[PDB]
Amino acid sequence: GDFRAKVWSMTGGPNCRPKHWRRNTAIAMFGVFLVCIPIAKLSAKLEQRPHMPVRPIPSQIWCKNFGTKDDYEKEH
Amino acid sequence: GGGMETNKNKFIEDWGSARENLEHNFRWTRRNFALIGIFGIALPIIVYKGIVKDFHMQDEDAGRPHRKFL
């Protein structure tokens, strides 16, 4: 309104129209992709697939934990 | 106009101060006797008897005598 233009918030307050919002949006998208790379690596490392799939699947490209839990007697 | 301090309202402050000084109003009435007898003696006793029985029912479920308490 009138006083809200003097109020700082993280989400930007009412009717937020930053002038450089396109470049900022692009920078945010690059940041989310960079953050997603290590998450994807950790997920691929951590995934456990006890059963071979019926047909080839995309996770077989990066995940090497297919058919490893067969000897569950030795689990600890 | 001037200041961040709240502009006091006399009735709101009267309400608050009445809340802070309730002990001066206690009269041993019939309603108060009933409320203290029910909620200050009886209900705690009932809860205690419940907790103890729970242990005794566990005791007899395990083939053991009743555990003495208190």
């Binding site: 993280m10 307050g13 | 301090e5 709101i12 909620f39 555990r67 208190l70």
Partner: protein, 494 residues
Amino acid sequence: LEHFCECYFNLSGLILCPVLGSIILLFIPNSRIRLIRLIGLCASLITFLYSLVLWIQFDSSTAKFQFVESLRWLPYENINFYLGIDGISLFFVILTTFLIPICILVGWSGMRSYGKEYIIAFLICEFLMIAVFCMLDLLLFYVFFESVLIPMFIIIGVWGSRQRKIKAAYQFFLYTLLGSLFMLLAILLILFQTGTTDLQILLTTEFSERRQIFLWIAFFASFAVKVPMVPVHIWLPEAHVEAPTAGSVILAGILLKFGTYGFLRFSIPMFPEATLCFTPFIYTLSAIAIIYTSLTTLRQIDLKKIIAYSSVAHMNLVTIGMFSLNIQGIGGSILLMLSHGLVSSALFLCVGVLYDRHKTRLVRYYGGLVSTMPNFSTIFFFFTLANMSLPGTSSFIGEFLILVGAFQRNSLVATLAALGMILGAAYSLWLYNRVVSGNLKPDFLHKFSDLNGREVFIFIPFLVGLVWMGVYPKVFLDCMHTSVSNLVQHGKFH
């Protein structure tokens, strides 16, 4: 026997730090406000770092006491006193050392009128409370606990907001002293049997079932006042509301923990048979406290009164956990003690932020603050969630572990204790929505300021600690398990 420890960083120096700060501040003119502020802040911060180091050198495999060092009172050496910690007391030392600099920082803006007396009182409190947590002797535990009454009395009486602080301070002092005298009586009865007050020896003496009953009651009379348990809880709302903000922080975050620490440290292991005999009694008292006090909280109209009543329900849940006498119960009781010490302190800090600007505690005056103080609103919401034991926050870990411990012993007590999930949500969300949500009321308040840099910084470590314990409580539980296990087993050999 000199029990001097090998470690460089030990307990005595951590005791000495705030003492030296206080002596130095005794002699600096009140005109040198900047110097006083900086010296007090730096002493407190150095003590905090020292406690962090003490956490690194801690050995999480032994059931013994660590850094044990000794302290020799007479050349006859009949009476010689020991300090030491374990996995039950370590994090309380850390919490004390962490909270004291927060207290100095909260009063930073008003220090020109607060003077050096404010900082000196808080430093003396720090020294006394660290001592209390580090004592392997009943009699010195007594002496160091009563000593905190003097600076706490001064803190409440001098820097409290209004004249009700008089009555509040009187009641605090008198209730606490009555409890302390009861536990002095217990200490002397023990001494007549054993001829000593050394904790390690008492853990290896056998008390009669009868002598145990009497000694347990005399310990209970101090500790239940300290916790507080109903019906000796009524001093707490008055005292925790009338105190200054930092005074309330120290009262809720540290001083309240002393009764539960006394239960964990002396009553449960020294008198296991009495502990067993009184367990239904403790369960009943705590369950009544949780339900009744939560419902009283619901009908309170003062911000500080709502936050103060909330602490009664939380501490009685802690007592249920610790008297469950298993790993979940005691671990959850300790974790909830630490988490409460963070969360209630942060909530008192939020209310203090509001009171410093507007000088009212009455909920009706506030409202619609989300539109003028969004940063405060967000932080307040986070700590409101933490006070409801929301999963992901630190308090949920302790709460659920205590419910686990209680359920395995008595399903009814766990059922009555889980009602807190419903009642605490109710009052916490009602408070938050009446303060922050809705519309502004410009006839009461029309001028506003969100948090400054100091307030944001003050809140940051509380947020970090809450999230850290909430998502990965393993760092704390790994250092505590051996001590907790030996506490649970003490008195039995199968």
